[PDB]
Amino acid sequence: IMRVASIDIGSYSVRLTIAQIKDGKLSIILERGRITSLGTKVKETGRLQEDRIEETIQVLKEYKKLIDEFKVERMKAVATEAIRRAKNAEEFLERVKREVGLVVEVITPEQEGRYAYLAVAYSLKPEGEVMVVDQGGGSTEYVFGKGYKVREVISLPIGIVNLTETFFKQDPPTEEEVKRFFEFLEKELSKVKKPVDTIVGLGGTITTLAALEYNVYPYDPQKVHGKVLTYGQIKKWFDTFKEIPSEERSKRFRQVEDRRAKVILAGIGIFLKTLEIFEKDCLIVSDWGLREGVLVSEMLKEN
Ligand SMILES: [Cl-]
């Protein structure tokens, strides 16, 4: 009985995941999430804020204690490329190494994509030529592969927060805004088109869609992981949300968190346009992604 852990340092939250390797199988035994907003003012000041840094470090010390407590044999900590936008990123990483004892790697979208594909290969085993569509954190990675072998990763920086602020100046958006919205996705997605047999979608938007479609509430990974969503099902939710204000979306559908109520429409559009462009009628939904993939990679180095 061995254990592995991963720590994901994002612009919004710091997340810990510990899994156990029992009977030659990976299972999550502990999780923790903490909002520290490390990306605050990085845009206007170009620097990580001292208060955000201090809190993040304190949460990391906490997670390290949990990791040592559970006596984890292998651990890996990663941070989003976004931190690269701060001139004091390296000082922050260095502080984390000395004070917490964690060597954080700022991974590229390509690395992120690989870890996410890894989690899918292990937890779903998609058939034939696979394409993983991971939306979240300000971008959407399109990863191609066969079995555990990743072929290529193509990352597009089309964050839903960015797209919503860019195209939907109104709440809900006007038909023209929506129209301009899709025109952009078509232009960008058409350039990534390739032949694939199985599409797997990852991220908050897609797991929320599955929860909506299959009436899952509260959220339960077991009832969402592996669920199938057709273009029609996804289109139905897109049409339901585009007709009402974000506030109503979260009020009428408990699966939609208020914080996501507004930007989710843009997220749904990404998957919609993706299926259309790649000429596929459906996709499989995965609850596992980056954070779990790091676990799979660490587990593979262990056996
Ligand atoms: Cl995003």
Short mmCIF file of C-alpha atoms and ligand atoms in Angstrom, two decimals:
data_model
loop_
_atom_site.label_atom_id
_atom_site.label_comp_id
_atom_site.label_asym_id
_atom_site.label_seq_id
_atom_site.Cartn_x
_atom_site.Cartn_y
_atom_site.Cartn_z
CA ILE A 1 0.00 0.00 0.00
CA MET A 2 1.70 3.12 -1.32
CA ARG A 3 0.61 6.71 -1.79
CA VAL A 4 1.29 9.59 -4.14
CA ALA A 5 0.25 13.24 -3.96
CA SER A 6 -0.02 16.19 -6.29
CA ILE A 7 -0.31 19.89 -5.57
CA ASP A 8 -1.72 22.24 -8.17
CA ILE A 9 -0.97 25.94 -7.67
CA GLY A 10 -3.38 28.03 -9.73
CA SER A 11 -4.13 31.73 -10.11
CA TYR A 12 -7.21 31.23 -7.93
CA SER A 13 -6.85 28.15 -5.75
CA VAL A 14 -4.22 25.80 -4.37
CA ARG A 15 -5.31 22.16 -4.51
CA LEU A 16 -3.96 18.98 -2.91
CA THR A 17 -4.77 15.42 -3.92
CA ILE A 18 -3.49 12.24 -2.32
CA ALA A 19 -4.19 8.82 -3.82
CA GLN A 20 -3.42 5.30 -2.70
CA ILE A 21 -2.02 2.51 -4.86
CA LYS A 22 -3.84 -0.56 -3.54
CA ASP A 23 -4.36 -3.83 -5.41
CA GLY A 24 -2.53 -2.20 -8.30
CA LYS A 25 -5.18 0.51 -8.58
CA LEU A 26 -5.27 4.30 -8.09
CA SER A 27 -7.91 5.75 -5.76
CA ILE A 28 -8.25 9.27 -4.31
CA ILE A 29 -8.12 9.15 -0.50
CA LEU A 30 -7.79 12.84 0.37
CA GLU A 31 -8.43 16.22 -1.22
CA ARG A 32 -8.15 19.85 -0.16
CA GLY A 33 -8.83 23.07 -1.95
CA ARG A 34 -7.96 26.58 -0.84
CA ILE A 35 -8.58 29.94 -2.48
CA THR A 36 -5.53 32.21 -2.27
CA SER A 37 -5.88 34.25 -5.48
CA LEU A 38 -2.20 34.20 -6.47
CA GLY A 39 -2.97 35.91 -9.76
CA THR A 40 -4.36 39.10 -8.20
CA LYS A 41 -3.16 42.35 -9.81
CA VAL A 42 -0.54 40.42 -11.76
CA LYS A 43 -1.96 42.16 -14.83
CA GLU A 44 -1.77 45.78 -13.67
CA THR A 45 1.36 45.49 -11.51
CA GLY A 46 3.10 42.60 -13.23
CA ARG A 47 3.97 41.15 -9.83
CA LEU A 48 2.62 38.57 -7.40
CA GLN A 49 1.22 40.37 -4.34
CA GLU A 50 2.97 39.80 -1.01
CA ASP A 51 -0.30 39.05 0.78
CA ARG A 52 -1.27 36.44 -1.81
CA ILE A 53 2.22 34.95 -1.62
CA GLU A 54 2.15 34.69 2.18
CA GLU A 55 -1.24 32.97 2.20
CA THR A 56 -0.28 30.56 -0.56
CA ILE A 57 2.90 29.60 1.32
CA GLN A 58 0.92 29.00 4.50
CA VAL A 59 -1.52 26.73 2.68
CA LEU A 60 1.41 24.85 1.15
CA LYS A 61 2.97 24.26 4.55
CA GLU A 62 -0.41 22.85 5.60
CA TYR A 63 -0.55 20.49 2.62
CA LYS A 64 3.06 19.40 3.22
CA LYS A 65 2.11 18.41 6.78
CA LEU A 66 -0.79 16.36 5.44
CA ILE A 67 1.56 14.78 2.91
CA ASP A 68 4.13 13.88 5.57
CA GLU A 69 1.36 12.70 7.89
CA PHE A 70 0.02 10.31 5.25
CA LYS A 71 3.66 9.39 4.65
CA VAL A 72 3.50 9.87 0.87
CA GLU A 73 6.30 8.16 -1.07
CA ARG A 74 6.12 10.39 -4.16
CA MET A 75 4.82 13.94 -4.50
CA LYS A 76 4.75 16.47 -7.33
CA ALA A 77 3.78 20.15 -7.22
CA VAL A 78 2.95 22.17 -10.32
CA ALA A 79 1.91 25.76 -11.07
CA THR A 80 0.17 27.32 -14.08
CA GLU A 81 2.22 29.13 -16.74
CA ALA A 82 0.24 32.25 -15.77
CA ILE A 83 2.63 32.86 -12.88
CA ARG A 84 5.25 33.51 -15.57
CA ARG A 85 3.55 36.86 -16.12
CA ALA A 86 4.94 38.05 -12.79
CA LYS A 87 8.56 39.25 -12.64
CA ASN A 88 8.87 37.85 -9.10
CA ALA A 89 7.72 34.35 -10.06
CA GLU A 90 11.15 32.82 -9.44
CA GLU A 91 11.48 34.50 -6.05
CA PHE A 92 8.11 33.03 -5.12
CA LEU A 93 9.10 29.55 -6.29
CA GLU A 94 12.40 29.81 -4.42
CA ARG A 95 10.60 30.82 -1.22
CA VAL A 96 8.36 27.77 -1.57
CA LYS A 97 11.36 25.47 -1.90
CA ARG A 98 13.15 26.75 1.22
CA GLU A 99 10.14 27.32 3.50
CA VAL A 100 7.89 24.38 2.56
CA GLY A 101 10.36 21.94 1.05
CA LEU A 102 8.45 21.76 -2.23
CA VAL A 103 10.11 22.03 -5.64
CA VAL A 104 7.39 23.60 -7.78
CA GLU A 105 7.50 23.17 -11.55
CA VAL A 106 5.72 25.80 -13.63
CA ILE A 107 4.38 23.57 -16.38
CA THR A 108 3.61 24.59 -19.97
CA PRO A 109 0.21 24.08 -21.62
CA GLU A 110 1.81 21.17 -23.49
CA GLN A 111 2.84 19.50 -20.20
CA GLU A 112 -0.58 20.24 -18.69
CA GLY A 113 -2.22 18.68 -21.70
CA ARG A 114 -0.08 15.56 -21.30
CA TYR A 115 -0.96 15.11 -17.65
CA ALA A 116 -4.66 15.55 -18.45
CA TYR A 117 -4.47 12.99 -21.25
CA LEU A 118 -2.68 10.65 -18.84
CA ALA A 119 -5.55 10.89 -16.36
CA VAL A 120 -8.03 10.09 -19.15
CA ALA A 121 -6.07 7.13 -20.54
CA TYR A 122 -6.00 5.61 -17.07
CA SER A 123 -9.58 6.42 -16.02
CA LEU A 124 -11.54 5.95 -19.25
CA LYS A 125 -9.27 4.23 -21.77
CA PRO A 126 -10.73 5.97 -24.85
CA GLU A 127 -10.70 3.83 -28.02
CA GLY A 128 -8.77 4.39 -31.25
CA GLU A 129 -7.45 7.84 -32.08
CA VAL A 130 -8.31 9.98 -29.05
CA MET A 131 -8.66 13.74 -28.64
CA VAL A 132 -8.90 15.26 -25.18
CA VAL A 133 -10.49 18.69 -24.94
CA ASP A 134 -9.54 20.26 -21.60
CA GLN A 135 -11.11 23.67 -21.01
CA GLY A 136 -10.10 25.68 -17.95
CA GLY A 137 -7.62 28.11 -16.42
CA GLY A 138 -7.81 30.54 -19.33
CA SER A 139 -7.22 28.10 -22.16
CA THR A 140 -8.39 24.95 -23.89
CA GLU A 141 -5.96 22.16 -24.72
CA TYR A 142 -6.66 19.79 -27.57
CA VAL A 143 -4.58 16.65 -27.02
CA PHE A 144 -4.30 13.81 -29.56
CA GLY A 145 -3.35 10.22 -28.89
CA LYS A 146 -3.78 6.46 -29.01
CA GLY A 147 -3.84 4.52 -25.76
CA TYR A 148 -1.45 5.97 -23.16
CA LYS A 149 0.64 7.45 -25.98
CA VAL A 150 0.13 11.18 -26.48
CA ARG A 151 0.82 12.33 -30.04
CA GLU A 152 0.47 16.11 -29.94
CA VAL A 153 -0.95 18.93 -27.83
CA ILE A 154 -2.42 22.14 -29.24
CA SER A 155 -3.27 24.82 -26.69
CA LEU A 156 -5.50 27.79 -27.51
CA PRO A 157 -5.65 30.75 -25.09
CA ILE A 158 -9.42 31.27 -25.33
CA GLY A 159 -10.34 31.60 -21.67
CA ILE A 160 -14.08 31.75 -21.04
CA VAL A 161 -13.62 34.81 -18.83
CA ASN A 162 -11.78 36.47 -21.73
CA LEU A 163 -14.30 35.40 -24.38
CA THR A 164 -17.26 36.53 -22.26
CA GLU A 165 -15.73 39.93 -21.57
CA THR A 166 -14.71 40.24 -25.22
CA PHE A 167 -17.91 39.22 -27.05
CA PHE A 168 -20.81 39.45 -24.60
CA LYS A 169 -21.00 43.12 -23.62
CA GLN A 170 -24.59 42.37 -22.61
CA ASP A 171 -26.18 39.93 -20.12
CA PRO A 172 -27.50 37.85 -21.74
CA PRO A 173 -25.61 38.52 -24.99
CA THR A 174 -27.36 39.82 -28.10
CA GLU A 175 -27.74 37.53 -31.12
CA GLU A 176 -25.00 39.50 -32.85
CA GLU A 177 -22.57 39.12 -29.95
CA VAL A 178 -23.26 35.38 -29.90
CA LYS A 179 -22.84 35.35 -33.69
CA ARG A 180 -19.47 37.15 -33.54
CA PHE A 181 -18.61 34.78 -30.70
CA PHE A 182 -19.02 31.64 -32.82
CA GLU A 183 -17.38 33.22 -35.87
CA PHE A 184 -14.22 33.56 -33.82
CA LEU A 185 -14.30 29.97 -32.54
CA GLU A 186 -14.85 28.64 -36.05
CA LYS A 187 -11.83 30.56 -37.32
CA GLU A 188 -9.65 29.35 -34.45
CA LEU A 189 -10.96 25.78 -34.19
CA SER A 190 -11.07 25.06 -37.93
CA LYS A 191 -7.28 25.46 -37.86
CA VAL A 192 -6.90 22.56 -35.40
CA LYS A 193 -9.15 20.06 -37.19
CA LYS A 194 -7.83 16.49 -37.45
CA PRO A 195 -9.33 12.99 -37.77
CA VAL A 196 -10.28 11.48 -34.40
CA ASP A 197 -12.39 8.54 -33.19
CA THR A 198 -13.18 9.46 -29.58
CA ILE A 199 -13.50 12.89 -27.99
CA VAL A 200 -13.21 13.36 -24.22
CA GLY A 201 -14.11 16.64 -22.56
CA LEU A 202 -12.62 17.93 -19.31
CA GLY A 203 -13.22 20.97 -17.13
CA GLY A 204 -15.82 22.74 -15.04
CA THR A 205 -18.03 23.64 -17.99
CA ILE A 206 -18.38 20.10 -19.34
CA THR A 207 -18.83 18.34 -15.96
CA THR A 208 -21.43 21.00 -15.13
CA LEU A 209 -23.20 20.25 -18.42
CA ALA A 210 -23.30 16.55 -17.58
CA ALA A 211 -24.61 17.36 -14.11
CA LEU A 212 -27.29 19.52 -15.69
CA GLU A 213 -28.26 16.96 -18.33
CA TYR A 214 -28.40 14.02 -15.95
CA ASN A 215 -29.84 15.90 -12.97
CA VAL A 216 -26.89 15.33 -10.66
CA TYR A 217 -26.97 17.40 -7.47
CA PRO A 218 -25.01 17.94 -5.42
CA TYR A 219 -22.05 17.13 -7.69
CA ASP A 220 -21.07 13.47 -7.57
CA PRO A 221 -18.00 12.36 -9.61
CA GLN A 222 -19.46 8.85 -9.87
CA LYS A 223 -22.59 10.05 -11.65
CA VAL A 224 -20.71 12.28 -14.08
CA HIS A 225 -17.48 10.50 -14.97
CA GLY A 226 -17.99 8.47 -18.15
CA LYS A 227 -21.31 10.10 -19.04
CA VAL A 228 -21.91 10.76 -22.73
CA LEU A 229 -23.12 14.08 -24.14
CA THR A 230 -24.33 14.46 -27.72
CA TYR A 231 -24.13 17.64 -29.77
CA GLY A 232 -27.91 17.91 -29.36
CA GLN A 233 -27.85 17.69 -25.58
CA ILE A 234 -25.13 20.33 -25.40
CA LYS A 235 -26.95 22.50 -27.93
CA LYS A 236 -30.11 22.30 -25.79
CA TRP A 237 -28.34 23.72 -22.75
CA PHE A 238 -26.66 26.41 -24.81
CA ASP A 239 -30.07 27.57 -26.08
CA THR A 240 -31.57 27.50 -22.58
CA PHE A 241 -28.84 29.69 -21.05
CA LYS A 242 -28.39 32.16 -23.92
CA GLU A 243 -32.03 33.23 -23.48
CA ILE A 244 -31.70 34.33 -19.84
CA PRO A 245 -29.52 36.53 -17.57
CA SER A 246 -26.64 34.83 -15.74
CA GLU A 247 -28.38 35.40 -12.39
CA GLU A 248 -31.37 33.36 -13.55
CA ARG A 249 -29.15 30.53 -14.79
CA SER A 250 -27.81 29.98 -11.27
CA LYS A 251 -31.22 30.58 -9.71
CA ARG A 252 -33.09 28.14 -11.96
CA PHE A 253 -30.42 25.44 -12.10
CA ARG A 254 -28.72 24.51 -8.84
CA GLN A 255 -25.85 22.76 -10.66
CA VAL A 256 -24.67 26.16 -11.91
CA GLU A 257 -22.62 28.09 -9.33
CA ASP A 258 -23.12 31.86 -9.29
CA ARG A 259 -19.41 32.41 -9.93
CA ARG A 260 -19.82 30.48 -13.20
CA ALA A 261 -23.32 31.64 -14.15
CA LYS A 262 -22.05 34.26 -16.58
CA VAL A 263 -18.99 32.68 -18.17
CA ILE A 264 -20.44 29.18 -18.63
CA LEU A 265 -22.33 30.17 -21.80
CA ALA A 266 -18.99 30.81 -23.53
CA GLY A 267 -17.65 27.52 -22.18
CA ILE A 268 -20.59 25.60 -23.61
CA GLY A 269 -20.03 27.28 -26.96
CA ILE A 270 -16.47 26.01 -27.09
CA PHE A 271 -17.57 22.39 -26.84
CA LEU A 272 -20.44 23.00 -29.24
CA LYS A 273 -18.22 24.51 -31.94
CA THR A 274 -15.62 21.80 -31.25
CA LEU A 275 -17.98 18.93 -32.02
CA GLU A 276 -19.25 20.70 -35.15
CA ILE A 277 -15.76 21.44 -36.45
CA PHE A 278 -14.44 17.91 -35.81
CA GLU A 279 -17.61 16.37 -37.25
CA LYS A 280 -18.41 14.28 -34.18
CA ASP A 281 -21.86 13.66 -32.69
CA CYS A 282 -20.77 13.09 -29.09
CA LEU A 283 -18.00 13.11 -26.49
CA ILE A 284 -17.28 11.35 -23.22
CA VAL A 285 -17.07 13.43 -20.04
CA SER A 286 -14.16 12.95 -17.67
CA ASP A 287 -14.08 14.05 -14.04
CA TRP A 288 -10.32 13.39 -14.03
CA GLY A 289 -7.75 15.79 -15.48
CA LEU A 290 -4.45 17.54 -14.68
CA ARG A 291 -4.41 16.98 -10.91
CA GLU A 292 -5.19 13.27 -11.21
CA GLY A 293 -2.82 12.84 -14.16
CA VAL A 294 0.10 14.04 -12.08
CA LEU A 295 -0.90 11.23 -9.70
CA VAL A 296 -0.90 8.70 -12.54
CA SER A 297 2.52 9.85 -13.75
CA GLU A 298 3.97 9.65 -10.24
CA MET A 299 2.38 6.23 -9.73
CA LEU A 300 3.93 4.98 -12.96
CA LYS A 301 7.39 6.04 -11.78
CA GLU A 302 6.74 4.15 -8.54
CA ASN A 303 5.74 0.64 -9.65
CL CL B 1 -11.01 28.81 -19.42
#
